[PDB]
């Protein structure tokens, strides 16, 4: 490394090199920090975590018990050891607490003043962070498996919601219009994700093994259906063009938004070109999931090489996105792992699990 410092200092390399390379080096060194803890507040498993996109200071966390906890990730104490204390919490006594498991929780991109959370009580509630009161409640006729607000839309403020119904609901937070539906799936929608590149592209994955990308502006159905083989097994599309051979319970666009990673219960992950949904044939090997609900996984950002961190049973498996090489499997949870979220500032990973723990993985040295 001192070579890296000397290269930065002399302008041999752009300073971008040392960031990105050092960021990567940090990611490869992720290790369970016992020099950092997250305060236990969930009585039930953590289904979801979300670090705020601006300033990355606060994390939301949704539990199987229905509570939403709001954690502060900055070490405000002077010690080197700290516990990420829980700022607020939608507890059992809140009048608005969810009744059943919170399945997704998301900071409003663009501003930390409002977050949204959806549950198995069939509601997507929008919250004022400051007063911690709901500002809006959308009711759905079927249990919500995931939602997602666009990380990029300065223009629209749609929330895509996937329920057990076969239809994707778009909920407009600007005047509250929960009527719009995308129709074309056939079984529950286990994962939705807006594109980080394009304002109005949404990808939705369903238990029917199909993943569709939609231009929600468009009035004409899906843009693309991802097909495992790219056409080697080609049929008039009524049942073919499955992304997976099981349920597809996870989606994640890569950072720059040029590829889509889907995980499904055939124990595979695939990487897809998000422009024409073609399959890049990245291998990745066998990725165990048997989650019956959405599997929340992330990608890294701002490294030399992009990584994807996928819950693999009771561990987080780290893979290199574009080559498939499994970097490592981070082993520190006790029960299955439900969600991992990446802190892009410091290359830290937080992962929740059914054992009611949120473990921080920070680079060593």
């Amino acid at each position: 490394m001192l070579g890296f410092l000397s290269a930065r200092q002399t302008g041999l390399e752009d300073p971008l090199r040392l960031r990105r390379a050092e960021s990567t080096r940090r990611v490869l060194g992720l290790e369970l920090n016992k020099d950092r803890d997250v305060e236990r507040i969930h009585g039930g498993g953590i289904n979801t975590l979300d670090i705020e996109p601006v300033e990355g200071r606060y994390m939301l966390s949704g539990g199987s018990d229905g509570v939403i906890v709001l954690y502060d990730l900055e070490n405000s104490s002077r010690q080197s050891y700290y516990t990420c204390k829980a700022v607020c919490s939608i507890g059992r006594d809140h009048p608005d607490v969810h009744r059943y498991s919170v399945e997704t929780v998301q900071w409003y991109p663009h501003d930390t003043g409002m977050f949204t959370s959806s549950s198995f009580d069939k509601t997507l509630k929008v919250w004022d962070t400051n007063t911690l009161q709901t500002a809006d409640v959308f009711n759905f006729e079927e249990t919500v498996y995931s939602h997602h607000m666009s990380p990029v839309s300065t223009k629209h403020c749609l929330v895509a919601v996937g329920t057990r119904g076969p239809k994707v609901q778009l909920c407009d937070l600007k005047s509250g219009s929960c009527s719009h539906i995308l129709q074309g799936h056939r079984q529950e929608i286990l994962a939705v994700s807006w594109s980080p590149r394009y304002d109005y592209i949404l990808a939705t994955a369903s238990a029917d093994s199909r993943v569709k990308l939609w231009d929600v502006r468009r009035a004409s159905g899906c843009l693309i259906t991802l097909d495992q083989h790219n056409g080697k097994k080609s049929q008039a599309v009524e049942s073919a063009n499955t992304a997976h051979n099981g349920k597809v319970n996870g989606l994640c666009f890569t950072s720059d938004g040029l590829h889509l990673l889907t995980v499904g219960t055939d124990n595979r992950m695939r990487l897809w070109n998000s422009s024409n949904g073609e399959n890049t044939l990245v291998n990745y090997g066998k990725v165990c999931n048997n989650s019956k609900k959405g599997l929340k996984f992330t990608v890294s950002c701002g490294c030399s090489s992009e990584f994807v961190f996928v819950p693999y049973g009771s561990t987080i498996a780290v893979y290199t996105v574009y080559s498939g090489e499994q970097i490592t499997m981070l082993k520190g949870h006790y029960k299955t792992v439900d969600c991992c979220v990446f802190q892009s500032n410091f290359q830290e990973l937080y992962s929740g699990s059914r054992d009611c723990n949120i473990l921080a993985w920070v680079p060593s040295l």
């Binding site: 663009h110 930390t112 003043g113 600007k174």
Partner: protein, 270 residues
């Protein structure tokens, strides 16, 4: 709408007078009898379809064509009050050298109107679903091109719907409908671009009869359309409860998440 463009388009004056016609003696008698008839009573009991009753009532209010009664042949003007009013209006307007546009929801009544206009010296041109389609646009063009043709009988279903009738000046809606849009487009045939002369709309209605209740229906509909097209602050239609008592005769005499949350709180405060 034609209010955000009127100053930028310069249309002429428009009027929407309504005339509450009074049912004549024979007309009154037939109506009073049929409301008291066992058939209406059975319809009120729901034993058969209501539509039959509504047809009958509308016919009665429209002309006593339930029963026909020299110079008292079928379709006699003096037998029905609305026809008397039409006589007076067409008289004054023909004296005004003005082109009239008379609409009727019915087609056979358009025939009785036709024979009437024979009985008068009013030169008309009639246009309904039975008039050939190929003769349709040339008929419209003919009426619009010359002022010789005075009145223009029209069934509202083909008479509405995109035809341009700027030639006519005066419009009278002779017969109400359950659909406000029908009469609206009917009256709007004249007051279009190219109408270089003032136009007034007369809605002829029978006070206290079925037609007033149909009027109430189409008002309530119009308010419902207004509540969702022009502005949601519509005033509640307080005049009627709108029940099945319409069989009676009662003649006269990035957003920064605080703009969002503010908007949300506004909507959910209601």
């Amino acid at each position: 709408m034609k209010s955000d463009v009127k100053m930028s388009l310069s249309l002429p004056d428009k009027n929407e007078q309504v005339l509450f016609c009074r049912l004549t003696d024979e007309q009154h008698k037939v109506y009073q009898n049929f409301v008291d008839s066992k058939e209406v009573y059975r319809i009120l009991n729901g034993e058969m379809q209501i539509f039959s009753g509504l047809i009958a009532l509308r016919k009665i209010c429209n002309h006593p064509d339930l029963f026909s009664g020299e110079e008292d042949q079928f379709g006699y003007w003096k037998r029905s009050g609305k026809m008397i009013v039409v006589e007076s209006l067409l008289k004054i307007w023909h004296k005004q050298g003005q082109r009239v546009l008379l609409f009727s929801q019915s087609r056979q009544m358009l025939d009785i109107l036709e024979v009437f206009l024979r009985a008068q010296k009013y030169t008309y041109l009639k246009m309904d679903g039975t008039t050939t389609i190929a003769s349709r646009q040339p008929l419209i063009t003919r009426y619009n091109e010359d002022t010789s043709i005075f009145v223009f009988l029209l069934t509202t279903r083909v008479g509405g719907l995109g035809v341009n009738l700027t030639g006519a000046n005066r419009v009278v809606i002779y017969d109400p409908d359950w659909n406000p849009s029908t009469d609206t487009q009917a009256r709007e045939r004249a007051w279009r671009i190219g109408q270089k002369k003032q136009v007034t709309v007369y809605r002829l209605l029978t006070a206290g009869t079925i037609e007033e209740k149909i009027y109430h229906r189409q008002i309530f509909k119009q308010f419902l359309t207004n509540r969702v097209l022009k502005d949601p602050k519509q005033r509640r239609f307080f005049k009627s409860n709108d029940l099945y008592e319409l069989f009676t005769l009662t003649s006269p005499d990035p957003l920064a998440s605080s703009s969002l949350l503010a908007k949300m709180r506004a909507r959910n405060h209601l």
